[PDB]
Amino acid sequence: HTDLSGKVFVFPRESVTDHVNLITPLEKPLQNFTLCFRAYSDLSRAYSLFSYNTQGRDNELLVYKERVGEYSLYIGRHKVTSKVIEKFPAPVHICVSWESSSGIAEFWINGTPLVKKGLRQGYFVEAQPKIVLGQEQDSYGGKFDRSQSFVGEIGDLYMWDSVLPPENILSAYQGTPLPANILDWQALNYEIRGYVIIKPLVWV
Amino acid sequence: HTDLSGKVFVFPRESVTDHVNLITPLEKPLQNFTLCFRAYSDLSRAYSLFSYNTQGRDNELLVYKERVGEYSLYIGRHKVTSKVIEKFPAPVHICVSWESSSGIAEFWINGTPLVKKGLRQGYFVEAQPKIVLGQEQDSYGGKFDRSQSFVGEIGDLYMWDSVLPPENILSAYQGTPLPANILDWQALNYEIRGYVIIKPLVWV
Amino acid sequence: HTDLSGKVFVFPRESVTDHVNLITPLEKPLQNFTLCFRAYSDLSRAYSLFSYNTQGRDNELLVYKERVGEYSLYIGRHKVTSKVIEKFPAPVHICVSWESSSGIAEFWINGTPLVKKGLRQGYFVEAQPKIVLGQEQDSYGGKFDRSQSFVGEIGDLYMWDSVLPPENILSAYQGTPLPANILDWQALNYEIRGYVIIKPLVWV
Amino acid sequence: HTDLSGKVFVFPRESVTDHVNLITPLEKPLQNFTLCFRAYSDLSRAYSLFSYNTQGRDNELLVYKERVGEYSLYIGRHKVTSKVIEKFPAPVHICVSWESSSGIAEFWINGTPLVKKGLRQGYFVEAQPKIVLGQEQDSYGGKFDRSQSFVGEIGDLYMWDSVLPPENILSAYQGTPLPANILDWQALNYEIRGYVIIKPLVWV
Amino acid sequence: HTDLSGKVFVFPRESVTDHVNLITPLEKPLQNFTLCFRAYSDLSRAYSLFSYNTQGRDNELLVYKERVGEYSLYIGRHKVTSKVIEKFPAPVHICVSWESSSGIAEFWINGTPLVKKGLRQGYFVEAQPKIVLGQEQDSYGGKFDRSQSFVGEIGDLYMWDSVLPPENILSAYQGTPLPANILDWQALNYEIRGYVIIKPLVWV
Ligand SMILES: *[C@@H]1O[C@H](CO)[C@@H](O)[C@H](O)[C@H]1NC(C)=O
Ligand SMILES: *[C@@H]1O[C@H](CO)[C@@H](O)[C@H](O)[C@H]1NC(C)=O
Ligand SMILES: *[C@@H]1O[C@H](CO)[C@@H](O)[C@H](O)[C@H]1NC(C)=O
Ligand SMILES: *[C@@H]1O[C@H](CO)[C@@H](O)[C@H](O)[C@H]1NC(C)=O
Ligand SMILES: *[C@@H]1O[C@H](CO)[C@@H](O)[C@H](O)[C@H]1NC(C)=O
Ligand SMILES: [Ca+2]
Ligand SMILES: [Ca+2]
Ligand SMILES: [Ca+2]
Ligand SMILES: [Ca+2]
Ligand SMILES: [Ca+2]
Ligand SMILES: [Ca+2]
Ligand SMILES: [Ca+2]
Ligand SMILES: [Ca+2]
Ligand SMILES: [Ca+2]
Ligand SMILES: [Ca+2]
């Protein structure tokens, strides 16, 4: 229940411990989800964008940037990666969905669909997560690694417990996002830890 | 048969097992043909796009992507290769025709003609094929190779027993193909084996 | 004798044998000429575009492609080379003229003039040629070299016994050449030898 | 006391001597500032753009160009660097702001925001500066280094004791800057030392 | 006394001999000048564009192309160099001015200003030159060097005994120069030596 409309989290330096915890009362394992957000970073090294771990389970749901032009999704430790043409540095809008019944993962980058990949067909993502921005978890809520830290700005984050169709992804990118039931930027419960500053969104 | 209008086959992972068999009652050897389809892959390694083998004959008709910008056609184990400027990764529309009487093979990539090449003048492509998407055959229906597997999405596949003129290739590129008498995406007889998922086409 | 309007010669493979002889009743040594044609090849190695030899004289008039972006004209074994920015692979329209009185050679690529060069001022190109497409001659009509063979398509070839002014070069580039009196694609006397196929021009 | 509208300082050669002192009446420590200026240089090596040293303190506020596409701000010897896509050589409009309360530094290059970075949260930039263009100070007003000298043109320099919002940054980029209370190009007190020439600005 | 409107000098081959002498009747030292001309060359090696030597003084005023994108001016044996983004090969319009009082040299390439540089403040360029196109002088009228020779085309050359403001530079670039008093293409006194041919300007 904070409205972050028009605002970003700024992670202004590299560190082991600067991060934001995102709080959701998620009790039911996820069969389907979509996650969208905008990010702006001038790192060239690898970094985590969104880290969701559960007790005893590393990389339960992880969105990770390998290198320029390459986005990975981990589900239950397993991973897929898809490629895109992108400028560097540049702001980006990222959406990723995953559907247990097919295993299909869909990345959409600036409203453009990447090649579909598939993993973990039939699996359910475990509930009661710890969700972190700014660092990559290796434990339940911690064991960070500064070489995977996100330095830069993140905004307009939403997470739904369904697979959004293309029209709803384009709405998030450049229209009005559909209100979201797991995490929603207009009513976000978060905890800042360390050096993270909230500022207006000034980039597109 | 099945009308896959608006849908693609998704080969969501690298494997030696995942494939689609395409069924056609082709009993008479082929003198002329055109094959068109759309594909979207972010593989950089080589892969097979369309594998047609007959009893005792490898690479009887094979469309093979050597590397970015380079397309090969095999007829009766002989090959030609032509080059094109293309972005990577990117969706592509591919048409290729071959005419026994001249030996001429014509690739068209996104409605643009590649340099003509020639092979197997006077040859007849044998009938009673096994036709596979997703893997390259080295036997009659099998002996796949993971390093040649196709990972990504294929749709809008049509095959004619004649050489299409430019206007009919552009029609196919634009999404209004002429009726096709060997394989037709709107009345396709196929078998999924392994991990292949049918999804809507979202990238055209 | 044959009107090849709308048609190309296709040299569909690398060889030391495949060629076209162009026949013209040229009995008087040439003081001035312009030669225009369209070509489409995806070779990266060097190749001959137009080979004119006379008895006892190799490289009497030769248009040669050194590498991407570089065009050479030989007159009586001496050469000039001019450079241009071009895409690869791409169709190209090439015009070259030479004027004995000044020695000036003008290349025009896709209707744009290259830097003028000069050679053989005062020379007359010898008459009674053998003129070959598809191979580079080292004798009077023969002694070909596979490594200089042209693979690809040639069309719209015209040769005048004068130096065309710019607006006449542009007319030829646009597909409306002024009347040509040495070689004329719309009334061409030729001989196919080996594997050369006439097909419609589909890339203009 | 001088309106330099429409004019630039030209540092026409590499040297360890040529520089401009900028004189400001500011006597209180700075908690917030914005600095904007336009520069045109064809140096590839690193160079100082704006050097603000105070007695006893090197690099108290320093704007430094590491290499093409990379801009650094030093505050009290600590630094941040942000990246941008830019052509070389090219004129550039540079703005940078810093806010003590958050430590946030914002670079804007040709009206486009770079990724925010943070340093020196809670710090006060010392007053009674010597402010130098053309050279990088290693002492209070001197100790220059030829290899960090600025060669080229600088104009349209303004410095405010506040953090400008995006609209006011864009106004400056577009040529209608707000009046500026630390340094103002339209009412500037300066001292030329060595070879620095004032000329009309011809490159906007 | 010759009007070369619409014509160029073509230096069609590398040599240590081919050149044009340009003769001015204005006999006076130069405190200010501007020189404009068009050039088209596909050399990659260094070459002289305009060579002005006086008795016993080499490199008294020299415009020299170091390599792609780099232009140098020598005044009295001292030099400056400025860089520009340009295509290769490409026609170019070059203007350069120099002002003794400030030492400032201004290059303009296709109507766009390069970074100003400065040299020889207070010097007077000596009177009674030999002015050569096509070769770089090392003596008064001679001692050429084939590795510095200009191959290609030069036209629309004008030289004024003043520093042109930007609007007059743009007029020259656009083909409507102000009449010029040191050298003027519409009333030029020149001597061709060796192989230099006058042809129409076809590349503007
Ligand atoms: C996931 O979606 C599938 C099909 O769209 C549906 O069967 C299932 O109920 C969804 N799961 C949940 C928990 O909503
Ligand atoms: C194949 O094409 C050739 C050339 O157009 C034609 O003559 C022949 O009839 C065709 N063959 C069949 C089986 O249609
Ligand atoms: C070749 O061109 C020159 C120069 O224009 C001309 O004088 C000469 O007559 C021409 N030669 C011919 C037509 O044989
Ligand atoms: C510095 O800038 C901030 C802008 O958020 C402002 O709130 C604060 O009052 C300023 N401090 C001073 C000393 O002016
Ligand atoms: C040189 O040019 C400047 C303007 O650029 C002018 O003010 C000055 O009078 C000129 N000097 C002469 C003509 O000697
Ligand atoms: Ca982890
Ligand atoms: Ca980790
Ligand atoms: Ca095979
Ligand atoms: Ca195989
Ligand atoms: Ca030869
Ligand atoms: Ca040869
Ligand atoms: Ca310093
Ligand atoms: Ca220093
Ligand atoms: Ca010299
Ligand atoms: Ca010399």
The reply to whether ligand 2 has any atom less than 6 angstroms from the CB of B171 is: no
CA-CA distance, C155 to C133, in Å (whole number)? 11
For the CA atoms of D159, D162, D167, D169, what is the dihedral angle to 10 degrees? Answer: 30
Read off φ and ψ for residue A36, nearest 5 degrees: -125, 145
CA-CA distance, A191 to A99, in Å (whole number)? 29
| 8 Å CB contact between B120 and B76 | yes
Residue spans of beta strands (DSSP E) within chain D: 7-11, 19-23, 32-40, 47-54, 57-67, 70-75, 78-83, 92-99, 104-109, 112-113, 117-118, 130-133, 152-160, 183-184, 189-193, 197-200
Number of helices and strands in chain D (H, E): 1, 16
Residue spans of beta strands (DSSP E) within B134-200: 152-160, 183-184, 190-193, 197-200
CA distances from residue C112 to C66, C115, C161 in whole angstroms, order as listed: 19, 10, 21
Pocket test residue of E34, E97, E101, E121 for ligand 5, highest count of atoms within 8 A of CB? E101
State the Rg of chain D over Cα: 15
CA-CA distance, A178 to A160, in Å (whole number)? 9
Exposure on the CB side of residue A174, measured as CA atoms within 13 A: 9
Residue B26 CA, ligand 5 centroid: distance in Å: 89
Q: Sign of torsion, CA B175 B178 B179 B184?
A: negative
How many structural domains are present in chain A?
1
| 8 Å CB contact between D75 and D129 | no
Residue the block writes with tokens 């719309």: C186
Residue B34 CA, ligand 2 centroid: distance in Å: 12
Residue A135 CA, ligand 6 centroid: distance in Å: 9
A149-170: buried (b, 16+ CB within 10 Å) or exposed (e) per residue?
A: bbbbbbbbbbbbebbbeeebbe
CA-CA distance, B42 to B38, in Å (whole number)? 14
Task: Tell me the residues of chain C between 15 and 74 that have a Cβ less than 8 Å away from chain E.
Answer: none
Write the single-letter amino acid at C162.
S
CA-CA distance, B142 to B131, in Å (whole number)? 10
| 8 Å CB contact between C131 and C114 | no
Write the single-letter amino acid at E32.
N
| 8 Å CB contact between E82 and E115 | yes
CA-CA distance, C75 to C96, in Å (whole number)? 12
CA-CA distance, D61 to D63, in Å (whole number)? 7
CA-CA distance, A168 to A176, in Å (whole number)? 9
The reply to whether ligand 2 has any atom less than 6 angstroms from the CB of B15 is: no
Resolution of the coordinates in A? 1.5
Pocket test residue of A27, A28, A30, A32 for ligand 1, highest count of atoms within 8 A of CB? A32
- Residue D121 annotated in ligand binding: no
Q: Sign of torsion, CA A132 A136 A141 A144?
A: negative
Exposure on the CB side of residue E12, measured as CA atoms within 13 A: 22
CA-CA distance, D38 to D16, in Å (whole number)? 22
Nearest to B13 by CA among B54, B43, B55, B53: B43
CA distances from residue A66 to A69, A86, A103, B2, D107 in whole angstroms, order as listed: 8, 14, 21, 40, 26
Strands E7-11 and E152-160 turn out to be antiparallel
CA-CA distance, B162 to B174, in Å (whole number)? 19
Q: What letter would DSSP give residue E155?
A: E
Nearest to A61 by CA among A145, A149, A156, A161: A161
- CATH number where B29 lies: 2.60.120.200
Residue C190 CA, ligand 14 centroid: distance in Å: 56
CA distances from residue C88 to A156, B84, C69 in whole angstroms, order as listed: 43, 8, 9
CA-CA distance, D37 to D180, in Å (whole number)? 12
Domain enclosing residue E118, as ranges = 1-204
CA-CA distance, B25 to B42, in Å (whole number)? 33
Token couple for B146 = 């993971």
Q: Is the peptide bond before C89 cis (omega within 30 degrees of 0)?
A: yes
**Which residues, at least 6 apart from E136, have a Cβ–Cβ distance to it below 8 Å?**
E47, E48, E51, E62, E64, E144, E145, E148, E149
Task: Tell me the residues of chain D between 106 and 145 that have a Cβ less than 8 Å away from chain E.
Answer: none
**Which residues, at least 6 apart from A165, have a Cβ–Cβ distance to it below 8 Å?**
none
CA-CA distance, C24 to C183, in Å (whole number)? 7
Q: How would DSSP label each residue in D57-81?
A: EEEEEEEEEEETTEEEEEETTEEEE
Instruction: Tell me whether residues A119 and B12 touch, CB distance under 8 A.
Output: yes
Instruction: Tell me whether residues D102 and A41 touch, CB distance under 8 A.
Output: no
Token couple for D183 = 């340094």
- Nearest by CB: A42 against D82, D112, D118: D82
CA distances from residue D106 to A203, D34, D73 in whole angstroms, order as listed: 12, 9, 10
- Nearest by CB: A153 against D103, D112, D116: D116
B79 in contact with C, Cβ within 8 Å? no
**Which residues, at least 6 apart from B193, have a Cβ–Cβ distance to it below 8 Å?**
B17, B18, B19, B20, B21
Read off φ and ψ for residue B119, nearest 5 degrees: -160, 150
| 8 Å CB contact between A66 and A50 | no
- Residue E136 annotated in ligand binding: yes
What method was applied to determine this entry? Answer: X-ray
**Which residues, at least 6 apart from D107, have a Cβ–Cβ distance to it below 8 Å?**
D71, D73, D82, D84, D94, D95, D96, D113, D114
* Distance between E85 CA and the closest CA of chain C, angstroms: 15
Judged by DSSP in three states, A125 sits in strand
Chains A and D touch (3+ CB pairs under 8 A): yes
